Write an enzyme that holds these catalytic residues in place. Structure first.
Site, mmCIF file in Angstrom:
data_model
loop_
_atom_site.group_PDB
_atom_site.id
_atom_site.type_symbol
_atom_site.label_atom_id
_atom_site.label_comp_id
_atom_site.label_asym_id
_atom_site.label_seq_id
_atom_site.Cartn_x
_atom_site.Cartn_y
_atom_site.Cartn_z
ATOM 1 C CG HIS A 12 -2.149 -1.179 0.927
ATOM 2 N ND1 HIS A 12 -2.593 -1.198 -0.263
ATOM 3 C CD2 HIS A 12 -2.052 -2.385 1.732
ATOM 4 C CE1 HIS A 12 -3.497 -2.363 -0.158
ATOM 5 N NE2 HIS A 12 -3.146 -3.072 1.127
ATOM 6 C CE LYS A 41 -3.832 -7.200 -2.482
ATOM 7 N NZ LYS A 41 -5.073 -6.381 -2.506
ATOM 8 C CG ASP A 121 -12.118 -1.659 5.499
ATOM 9 O OD1 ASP A 121 -11.760 -3.017 5.549
ATOM 10 O OD2 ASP A 121 -13.239 -1.103 5.874
HETATM 11 CL CL LIG Z 1 -6.511 -2.354 -1.319
#
Ligand SMILES: [Cl-]
Ligand SMILES: [Cl-]
Ligand SMILES: [Cl-]
Ligand SMILES: [Cl-]
Length: 124
Positions: A12, A41, A121
């Site tokens: 991230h 992914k 999230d």
């Molecule tokens: Cl994500």
């Protein structure tokens, strides 16, 4: 095994750029962050802020995670983000992603001591 905190960093964090500079950002980043290794992914957000600014979210606005747990925090301010999403045609091992750059609030799940992001999230 990677720690939950280190895995959040790898999947991230992009503190090195202010934003996605091309449509190919996601293809490059999903690959270099090892998110296309054994499968594609499907969805992944990168955050273009310092690690300290993202870690700080863990003591900002406490909100529900979409899974209904209560260790999620929304950033008070917007952040530079890039949403990476597999294209309808993408097939492993030729993963292909759509890059969307935006300024949005991030929501992260936090855990541990220190209390740091372990899951991305959503962005709002
Ligand atoms: Cl994500
Ligand atoms: Cl760690
Ligand atoms: Cl890795
Ligand atoms: Cl969690």
């Amino acid at each position: 095994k990677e720690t939950a905190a280190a895995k959040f960093e790898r999947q991230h964090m992009d503190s090195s750029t202010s934003a996605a500079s091309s449509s190919n950002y996601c293809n490059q980043m999903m690959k270099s962050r090892n998110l296309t290794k054994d499968r594609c992914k499907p969805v992944n957000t990168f955050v273009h802020e310092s690690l300290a600014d993202v870690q700080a979210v863990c003591s900002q606005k406490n909100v529900a995670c979409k899974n209904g747990q209560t260790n999620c925090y929304q950033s008070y301010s917007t952040m530079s983000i890039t949403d990476c999403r597999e294209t309808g045609s993408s097939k492993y091992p030729n993963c292909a992603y759509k890059t969307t750059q935006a300024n949005k609030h991030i929501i992260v799940a936090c855990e541990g001591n220190p209390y740091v992001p372990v899951h991305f999230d959503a962005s709002v």
